[PDB]
Write a protein that binds this ligand. Sequence first.
Ligand SMILES: [Fe+3]
Ligand SMILES: [Fe+3]
Lengths: 474, 474
Amino acid sequence: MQTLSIQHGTLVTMDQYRRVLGDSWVHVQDGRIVALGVHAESVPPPADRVIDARGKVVLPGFINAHTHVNQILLRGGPSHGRQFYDWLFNVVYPGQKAMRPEDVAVAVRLYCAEAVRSGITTINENADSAIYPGNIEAAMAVYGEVGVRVVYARMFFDRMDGRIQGYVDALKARSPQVELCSIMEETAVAKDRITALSDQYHGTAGGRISVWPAPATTTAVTVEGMRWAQAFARDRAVMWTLHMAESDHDERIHGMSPAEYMECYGLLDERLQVAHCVYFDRKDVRLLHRHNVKVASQVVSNAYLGSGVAPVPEMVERGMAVGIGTDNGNSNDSVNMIGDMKFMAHIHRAVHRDADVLTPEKILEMATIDGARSLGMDHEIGSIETGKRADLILLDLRHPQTTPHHHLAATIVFQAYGNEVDTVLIDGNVVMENRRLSFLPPERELAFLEEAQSRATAILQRANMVANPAWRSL
Amino acid sequence: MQTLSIQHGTLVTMDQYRRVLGDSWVHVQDGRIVALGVHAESVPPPADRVIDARGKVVLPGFINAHTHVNQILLRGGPSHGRQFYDWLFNVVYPGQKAMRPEDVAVAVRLYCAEAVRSGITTINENADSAIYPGNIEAAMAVYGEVGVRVVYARMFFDRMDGRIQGYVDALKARSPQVELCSIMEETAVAKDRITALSDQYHGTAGGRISVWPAPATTTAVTVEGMRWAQAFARDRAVMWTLHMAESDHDERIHGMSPAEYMECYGLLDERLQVAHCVYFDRKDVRLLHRHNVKVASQVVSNAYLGSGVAPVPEMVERGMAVGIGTDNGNSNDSVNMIGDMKFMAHIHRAVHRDADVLTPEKILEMATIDGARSLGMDHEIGSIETGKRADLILLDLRHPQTTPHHHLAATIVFQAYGNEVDTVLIDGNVVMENRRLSFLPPERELAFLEEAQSRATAILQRANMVANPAWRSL
Ligand SMILES: [Fe+3]
Ligand SMILES: [Fe+3]
């Protein structure tokens, strides 16, 4: 039994009573939070190592409820300015295709480096490139080494959407030299591939890695395919996830909303996590609420791609589990939970013309405990409580931007930039300490970033994509 | 300890599990439901009297969450076609003024007759005519005799709204021969009068009568007045109630919504029941939700007076306690919970373009258990559960309109007219049996109705109100 003691911190527990514990400590053992206490009232147990958190804030690790990792190598100029499908077919698919396994490994490490730096400890990777050979293995090796907690949601597409062909062909003419790609696969092939992947990797890296099935959308997946995924999630006590209504061209499947359609086939349940709820109406919300569907809101990305604004307050006010996702590494274009929290707070205040539509406490909940709920993992993660995993982060507010600070949630949401996280523990392991990354040490950092830059450039050459378009004011 | 056994009925319990118990019985003692059972599994206890409910449906008594009784003598021609304030100042105030105590007694008995006939067992009387001498006394005598459960919410006005004077003078010119009335009173006078009324009548008639304070509106009552009412409710373990935002001329007090205004002064709490939520926005709903404010929706009246349509589904979807009120006897113009339930179901389906916005089950809950909640009385009434008061109603569905019937809530909401109620018990006492009213026997009924007709006619003469306006198609 390895042990760790975090001492003299202010504990923002996000526990049942939302306790905030001044000058207090956390005892960790074998990856689990085993006890907590107040220093004035109790003495911490002896431990192999002590981390002094004096003058620091301790939080549960942030949870990235829905993201796409590999695409991070496509940010920096190629990705912006485009509506969802334009982005998807002229950038994302062709760019992903051009990526070799050694490229994917770098992307994953880069993504993880930025994520951990910003306090993110759990990542729901929606993987659209798992169809390409060697990619999975390359990625999983890095996830495991790095020590992050990962849900690997293996996306599949088993159905052509014939309605949208002419639209796509027209979009492709924008970059006619980038190649029109298809990642469709037969239903049975997808089942086999995902089942294999689950059998092999689910529970690996010390319980840190999970595998879920991810039918892509209601228009790109058959009923048979979604029913399988639903059944799979139930049989294996995990979740399934689906992208739902992310553009106005998806808004309507068979004369009804995607939620309506899913309801018709008995496809809304408590183990479903839907992502992207922009094109939702009152009824869609009601249906999701009725069946206890979990939600991931990609607020920044919904803006970036010009989709719009989801009805998060409406869902939250009904006690639904809504987490925050950064979305793609190239539809954001950061991996920074704090920046996105700020954005979640502000965009909804602005649109509702209501300064109190979401409290910063609530936003912080979305990033932590509620996010865990949306992953069906709230029993294991999301709060500083005895029994739960030691996924913990230490923030230093001793900086200009976060001075003064009194109310910690307000300070974090409205002031912090994302560089104030100091130490990060995942499953009891020290992944980052005084901003030094265990899986990317400072003496190796600059060289690694140069490798990532190069590979990115090369990827874009191979895909025939324009990296740096001409200066454009309008 | 007197006893009553209701047998061989189908029990629609509205209990914690929404149990519907076929061929089942209820045992009543000293006004309280002491046991329930299924006939096939168990034998009912011996009892002084048995009521055979064979082929009948047993429900908790309907709860009229917000109403105004006396005005019932002003229905039948004088009251319709007018916006809220036009109705208020040219019909309601002058008409009420013209009523003598002997008239009020008749009004109350007529109202109660109709109410009990339609299954209503609890009544939240918002009394705007309590200021006139002898009226309280007359009314209370009848409520007590009749055996209905009554909340007597004594309304007061201690503040002139100078902003709407010109509007009202213009409205008065519609019926210039009808006198402009004021029922304003000094803050201290109102406190004293209400406190006296409470001391005298609260808990009387075997616990069946309660007294609450009812500041009329946020524009017609001082902050000092509302705070007093709030404190009073707290100190005496009752509720306080307030009319909120019933017309577009109210929709703003001091540059903010009434709910916003109340929030500013700490005036929203869990003992508050607001009525009339038509001019409500998302933020108002949120505020009421935050503080667990109870609500009464007067759906039919909101239509009758041309106010509009309240966001009931939005409040209900947030688990708020929303009851159904019939409102004024002369802004409906019935006292029929079943008819109003039907209207609640349909108006919202039509406006939301959604056939399932409110299930008939949910509508039925609004009329019973949820209604009880909205009165702060859900521990005592609203469901067929052991420990609760024996406020119970028997419905006979053996009629053409309610045939066929399978799903009982659907049948009651979408088919029943309101004449299907047979036997009614309030606090264990039999108040109607086989449509015979204990407090208005059939051999006396016709003569009583002729007395009510006469007195009504006379009231209108005295108030100089037009009873029967000329035929008008446009
Ligand atoms: Fe996405
Ligand atoms: Fe009213």
